[PDB]
């Protein structure tokens, strides 16, 4: 009985790799960024980066390399997966659509061999002759590169050298030659081997083995004008080449290890280097021309340009622009300057890209006291540390709220032909019309002398020549502003009522059922121009000029009534150009034509809450993209509003949606509101850049939030945050963080920069006397953070050498107070395990932080959890329950303990508990007879756990060292005294992330069961839910069919990819389903869509809908 569902809620945001070249075309400069399973492809432009294509791989990317083989148009792409899927890819832009073709591919796994330390390295020879792979210790796999070998059959060659640190092919070699630093006792050395692929050996190298620094770790192959290698180490950098040897020991380098490099100038006269501390360096090579003897290397030099943010990834682009790919902090575009600016930096940031960093810990809070779901994360590390607040949907802040029932339309109004700020609002009601004035933040209800009030208004705008139009159902009126009078009035030849309005600024198009009349507002008179009659009754109309004319609309959008169809007309005539029959018999509700980017959009929404969208030339009228994307269930009404640069579209419904722009797509995000029926833009004298919104019975006006589907707040900390707990009754957060100080000349610690713990509004240090028994030191604190302003209210620093490891917010025993409890540990470098720590109880209740209790404890307080009125703490392989005395003292019964190392811990409101001991998941219940915990059950089958969660009483989610998820369940069968002691892996699944935190919660609420969010090292954020027999099978069905349909980049089976894989075993996946796969069903053509469907009922529509109910899960 095991059925689980898993979706991405936020795609991975950490950058794992990035590379530069010519892959879009030979005549382009691209940036290729590797997220986890994601390849992103940019064009380096002049403003910055132009996205072109974002693609999913069924595999963690581990090698990403561009190269052009002999006689080749553009660059090709080599990709090696962590599960050893190889492939070579091509960028084919054939049509107006873009594809990634698999020119070759195969799996390069070896049945033999241990995965090397320093990991998979992949490299490509300058001649493009071959691909070198270092996957396993003692083995070097060569893949020969020729026009054939579309399977990448390869061969291994024994590598005599046990333990290779880094490898590159050397430039300018009369045969592929390898260069590498390896380790044997005696330190490290650098060596060469020619690759003889002819006979599959190594031969000799083109130059002797040489010793290198103990910490040497990067090899750079310098290109042809120079040749040889650079070897970057600790405290020393050296050039090697034949008998030529150069070396420097610049002191600046001596701190932080250099982690990455990039070549700036194709001469290799200049390289960028990056630190762990994010200091960025220029490495310059000095060329010494002979006068006939060509160019030689005189010296090496390094200069500190400044500081980026900690980089996985560094890519010189064009003209002093650098992309900094960051894993532990936000990514960024950075301009390099010749002259050092203020602060003395050569580096100036142009752009910053959001990374949820490693999500180290998190929790869900209904932040602004709404039934929602805000995620708050401890993100990043060291100076990149921060909090992140993740919000779902787009919000709007309520300035004014005048209630007023039964509104049926809204139009903004301005009592001055001069400005662009309005001061009048128009509320059309069922039978009536009442106008509003605006003093500032005031709203009074008199009318305009020229406006009807006894009829219903279908339009109210501003026209031409000091004028203000009302198109009431009885007649289209015209009023002059300066001359306050009805300057003319059009009515229907036979006094029939106007049905559908339509009015830009210089043009009018009404309809009386099937009949249409095009009039004009040429000075001070309503002048008729045209008349046609429609094959059916008109449902909706829209006209707003699109570019080449300002006010004078050349085209007409129209919705009909029986053939449920939309069309494009030509207003001078009305002649029928292109018409499109939709399905069903539900009428078009609204239709609208607008301009966004390099696509002129005309879309139409139906009456059941469905929508269809269409791109179109304002030139002619061709049907473009078409996918039935449903919103609410109320007939949607469409509008245009001014925002940032680009001005967008707001869909009114019971499910308020806003339509933005993606790469060059249109974004679909929730608005965070009850139900909107009508909405207009604004610019008021008392309510500037705003929007007006009406429901069943309220009028509203305010500001609009970002743009994305998830909105993200950032709270920089400039240090490492490790743990976070929300405290409701105190309206704030406790965060444990730590910062790094250094060995002073005074001996002690200094300040490598201001951060949250050093710049807090107030502070306190530990005065405890519990203990009396050139270098880097962590210094740990407890931060108290306002849930509203996110300011660092108070910071308490723990003792010298005390690391805080665990944190909790709870009431204890009989006491009504909420104490934030912190479990610590005295940490010294020489020791393997600590023997000392404390449990401190603090109180934040008034306006400050009080140390209530201290409890000496014989080890490190790895985790803790409020049990059932007591404090369950896991101290260094022991588990002990603590009592909170009424004299405000914590105390245990020292013979009542546990032999468990609970690195991760969770509690079921019952007397239960999921731990981890000696690499396993365990289940324990409290037995008060023994004042103890009993070991109900265990998962034998070993697993290096990374996180752990209770789904319900019988099912337990785990995550592990090999990026796999699993569900353990307790046997419901006989010999309940042996087979009961064994819980069982009912579910398996290769997730491809490293999970640090699960927690019950959702970001959705204002149909399936459950909701567990999770946070990742890559910064991913997932969601997990339970299903049921039918769905799981149906969806399991849908998976296998979906595999056969979908084209996957490097020809990798989803089946292989999602299969649970460790060093020990490879099982297929069980009890799990990736929403990710199940959601890509919507991103298929109706064709391939009707394939997946052949055979309850089963249909392309019955089921399209199923998947959407699932999308609303996150």
């Amino acid at each position: 009985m095991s059925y689980n569902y898993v979706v991405t809620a936020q795609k991975p945001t950490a950058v794992n790799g990035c590379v530069t070249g010519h892959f879009t075309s030979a005549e382009d400069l691209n940036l290729l960024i590797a997220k986890n399973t994601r390849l992103e492809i940019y064009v380096v432009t002049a403003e910055g980066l132009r996205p072109v294509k974002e693609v999913g791989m069924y595999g963690k990317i581990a090698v990403m390399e561009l190269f052009r083989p002999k006689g080749e148009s553009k660059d090709l792409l080599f990709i090696l997966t962590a599960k050893y899927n190889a492939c070579i890819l091509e960028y084919k832009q054939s049509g107006e659509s873009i594809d990634i073709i698999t020119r070759a591919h195969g799996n390069v796994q070896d049945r033999i061999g241990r995965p090397s330390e320093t990991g998979i390295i992949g490299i490509i020879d300058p001649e493009c002759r071959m691909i070198g792979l270092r996957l396993y210790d003692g083995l070097f796999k060569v893949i020969p590169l020729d026009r054939d070998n579309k399977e990448l059959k390869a061969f291994n060659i024994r590598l005599e050298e046990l333990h290779v640190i880094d490898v590159k092919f050397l430039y300018g070699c009369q045969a592929p030659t390898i260069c590498f630093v390896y380790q044997d006792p005696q330190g490290r050395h650098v060596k060469t081997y020619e690759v003889s692929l002819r006979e599959k050996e190594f031969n000799k190298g083109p130059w002797k083995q040489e010793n290198v620094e103990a910490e040497a770790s990067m090899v750079i192959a310098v290109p042809e004008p120079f040749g040889g290698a650079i070897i970057i180490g600790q405290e020393s950098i050296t050039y090697h080449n034949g008998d030529k040897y150069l070396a420097i020991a610049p002191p600046i380098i001596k701190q932080s290890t250099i982690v990455c490099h990039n070549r700036v100038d194709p001469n290799g006269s200049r390289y960028l280097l990056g630190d762990m501390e994010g200091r960025l360096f220029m490495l310059l090579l000095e060329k010494e021309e002979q006068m006939d003897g060509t160019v030689t290397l005189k010296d090496l030099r390094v200069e500190l340009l400044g500081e980026t943010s900690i980089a996985e990834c560094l890519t010189y682009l064009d003209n002093g622009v650098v992309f900094v790919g960051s894993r532990l902090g936000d990514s960024q575009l950075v301009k390099l300057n010749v002259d050092s600016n203020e602060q003395g930096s050569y580096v100036v940031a142009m752009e910053t890209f959001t990374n949820l960093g490693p999500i180290v810990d998190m929790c869900v809070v209904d932040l602004e006291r709404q039934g929602q779901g805000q995620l708050v994360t401890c993100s990043g590390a060291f100076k990149e540390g921060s909090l992140r607040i993740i919000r779902n949907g787009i919000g709007i802040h309520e300035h004014a709220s005048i209630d007023l029932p039964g509104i049926k339309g809204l139009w903004p109004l301005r009592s001055d032909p001069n400005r662009e700020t309005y001061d009048t609002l128009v509320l059309s009601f069922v039978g009536q019309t009442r106008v509003l004035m605006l003093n500032g933040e005031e709203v009074e209800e008199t009318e305009l002398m020229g406006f009807v009030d006894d009829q219903q208004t279908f339009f109210c705008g501003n026209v031409a020549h000091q004028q203000l139009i009302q198109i009431t159902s009885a007649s289209v009126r015209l009023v002059s502003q300066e001359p306050k009078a009805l300057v003319s009035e059009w009515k229907e030849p036979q006094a029939k009522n106007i049905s559908v309005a339509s009015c830009n600024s210089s043009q009018v198009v009404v309809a009386v059922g099937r009949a249409l009349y095009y009039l004009q507002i040429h000075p001070q008179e309503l002048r008729q121009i045209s008349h046609t009659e429609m094959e059916h009754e008109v449902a909706c109309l829209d006209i707003t000029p699109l570019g080449d004319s300002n006010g004078l609309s050349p085209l007409c959008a129209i919705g009909l009534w029986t053939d449920i169809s939309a069309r494009i007309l030509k207003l001078p005539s009305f002649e029928l150009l292109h018409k499109e029959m939709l399905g069903g018999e539900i009428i078009p509700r609204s239709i609208l034509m607008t301009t966004f980017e390099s696509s002129h959009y005309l879309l139409c929404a139906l009456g059941d809450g469905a929508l269809f969208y269409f791109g179109l030339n304002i030139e002619t009228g061709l049907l473009s993209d078409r996918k039935k994307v449903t919103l609410g269930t109320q007939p949607t009404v469409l509008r245009t509003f001014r925002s940032l640069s680009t001005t967008n579209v707001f869909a009114c419904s019971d499910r308020p949606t806003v339509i933005y722009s993606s790469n060059h797509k249109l974004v679909f995000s929730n608005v965070n509101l009850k139900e909107v029926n009508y909405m207009c833009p604004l610019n008021s004298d008392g309510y500037p850049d705003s929007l007006a919104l009406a429901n069943n019975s309220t009028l509203t006006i305010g500001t609009i939030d970002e743009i994305q589907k998830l909105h993200i707040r950032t709270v920089p900390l400039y240090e490492s945050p490790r743990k976070i707990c929300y405290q409701e009754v105190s309206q704030c957060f406790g965060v444990l963080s730590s910062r790094i100080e250094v060995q002073d000349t005074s001996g002690g610690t200094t300040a490598l920069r201001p951060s949250a713990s050093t710049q807090a509004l107030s502070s306190s240090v530990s005065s405890s006397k519990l203990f009396s028994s050139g270098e880097e030191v962590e210094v740990h604190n407890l931060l108290i953070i306002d849930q509203h302003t996110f300011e660092v209210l108070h910071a308490h620093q723990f003792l010298q050498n005390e690391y805080a490891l665990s944190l909790v917010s709870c009431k204890l025993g009989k006491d009504p107070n909420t104490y934030f409890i912190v479990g610590t540990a005295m940490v010294y470098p020489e020791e393997a395990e600590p023997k000392q720590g404390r449990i401190v109880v603090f109180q934040y209740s008034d306006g400050k932080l009080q140390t209530v209790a201290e409890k000496e404890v014989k080890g490190a307080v790895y985790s803790m959890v409020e049990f059932n009125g007591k404090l369950l703490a896991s101290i260094n392989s022991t588990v002990r329950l603590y009592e909170w005395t009424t004299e405000k003292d914590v105390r245990t019964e020292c013979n009542h303990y546990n032999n468990i190392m609970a690195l991760y811990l969770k509690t079921k409101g019952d007397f239960i508990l999921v731990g981890d001991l000696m690499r396993s998941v365990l289940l324990l219940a409290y037995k008060p007879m023994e004042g103890n915990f009993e070991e109900i059950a265990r998962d034998f089958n070993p697993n290096w756990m990374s996180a752990v969660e209770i789904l319900d009483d019988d099912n337990f989610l785990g995550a592990e060292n090999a990026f796999n998820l699993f569900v353990c369940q307790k046997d419901s069968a006989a010999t309940t005294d042996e087979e009961r002691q064994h819980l069982q892996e009912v579910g398996l699944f290769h997730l491809g992330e490293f999970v640090n935190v699960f927690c019950h919660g959702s970001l959705v609420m204002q149909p399936t069961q459950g909701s567990v969010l999770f946070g990742t090292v890559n910064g991913m954020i997932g969601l997990v839910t339970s299903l049921s027999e039918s769905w799981y099978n149906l969806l399991l069905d849908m998976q296998n069919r979906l595999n056969k349909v979908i084209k996957s980049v490097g020809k990798i089976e989803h089946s292989f990819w999602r299969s649970f894989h460790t060093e020990r075993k490879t099982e297929p996946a069980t009890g799990f389903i990736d929403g990710d796969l199940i959601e890509s069903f919507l991103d298929i053509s109706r064709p391939k869509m009707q394939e997946v469907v052949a055979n309850r009922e089963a249909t392309a529509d019955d089921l399209i809908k199923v998947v959407e109910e699932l999308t609303r899960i996150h």
Binding site: M276, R327, L328, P358, V360, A381, S720, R722, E778, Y803, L805, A825, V827, Y828, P829, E831, A832, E833, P834, A860, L903, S946, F994, N996, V1017
Partner: peptide, 14 residues
């Protein structure tokens, strides 16, 4: 130390 091995692991390795 085990302790900082653990803090390293949640960062990945660093």
């Amino acid at each position: 130390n085990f302790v900082s091995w653990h803090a390293n692991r949640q960062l990945g390795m660093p």
